[PDB]
Amino acid sequence: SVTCPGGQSTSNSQCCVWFDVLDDLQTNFYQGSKCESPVRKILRIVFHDAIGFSPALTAAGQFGGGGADGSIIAHSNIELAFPANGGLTDTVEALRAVGINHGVSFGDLIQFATAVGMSNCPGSPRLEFLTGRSSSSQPSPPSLIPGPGNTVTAILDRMGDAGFSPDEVVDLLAAHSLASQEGLNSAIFRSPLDSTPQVFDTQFYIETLLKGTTQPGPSLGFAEELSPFPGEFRMRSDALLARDSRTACRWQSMTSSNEVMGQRYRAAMAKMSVLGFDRNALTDCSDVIPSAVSNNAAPVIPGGLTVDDIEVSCPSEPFPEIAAASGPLPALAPAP
Ligand code: HEM
Ligand SMILES: [Ca+2]
Ligand SMILES: [Ca+2]
DSSP: OEEOTTSOEESSGGGTHHHHHHHHIIIIITTTTOOSHHHHHHHHHHHHHHTOOOHHHHHTTSOOOOSSSOHHHHTHHHHTTSGGGTTOHHHHHHHHHHHHHHTOOHHHHHHHHHHHHHHTSTTOOOOOOEEOOOSOOOOOOSSOSOOTTSOHHHHHHHHHHHTOOHHHHHHHGGGGGGOEESSSOGGGTTEESSSOTTSOSSHHHHHHHBOOOBOOSSSOOTTEEOBSSTTOOEEHHHHHHHHSTTTHHHHHHTSSOHHHHHHHHHHHHHHHTTTTSOGGGSEEOGGGSOOOOOOOOOOEEOTTOOGGGBOOSOTTSOOOOOEEOOOSOOOOOOOO
């Protein structure tokens, strides 16, 4: 172990510069360690940066992308042009300054900002953090980011190419437990994906499984589906993945335990963080990441709706027992 200049203890000397980054991010980028939009935007950024990786393209004789190389920042002029990266400009520019001021690679910074950002949201597990990703990168090839307009097969094949199994795709989606949409239906700006956009819990999995009965906005978006109550938005891909026979059972098992959800998401994230890199060549600085406040609330079926309102899509396995909250039907306020 080593004692950094600031007095912080750590396992490797290269972890020291990250305590300075931490203080910078928590005070400015996260405006006081808050769990709001900046956290949600960073989670989109980490996924979009990392997923630009394709062994299949490489085999075909084309550049497949360098994975979690920070290319979304270094080559933002190109990547921010992709329609899948809309609404990320201001966040990318803010992160660029931090990386330059502290002399850290953008690949590492994105991964670090993700771990730190989630510690600001109750219920979040403590994500692993590795440092050492090269600072140089090439822009990601286009069309590598799965979208809400893609079929389930198209999403599984894209993710599978990158190295993810169908169940790991479900595990990664736990991030939609801290989510809203701004560009799918601008009429209802920041309508949340689950009833607790500031709590990393299983509500996302439970609520997407409820029968869709409500149109939250004036019209139904291009990639929107009816949701369970006013104010909540339901993305087409999320609704389909929860019901598809290839992903249904895993989705169903993610409803009953915040504990289990957290572990799987953390393992899946660790895998995504090294796409395009060799983990053995990186240094572990996970001890710099703070713990998030605990979430003691139990999972519930909200609004007086019961388990009978769930569209069980994996009947071959028992549907777990989940608490039920009395009515009335809630009306969600936009995510902060
Ligand atoms: C595997 C298929 C996935 C699809 C098709 C998908 C699609 C989308 C779309 C279209 C939005 C709304 C963006 C906007 O209008 O603001 C969104 C939001 C969001 N997604 Fe995903 N997503 C996927 C996975 C993920 C993953 C793997 C992560 C990260 C670990 C992630 C994190 C988020 C978050 C936190 C938001 C909220 C952003 C906000 O409130 O500003 N998503 N996603
Ligand atoms: Ca990248
Ligand atoms: Ca939530």
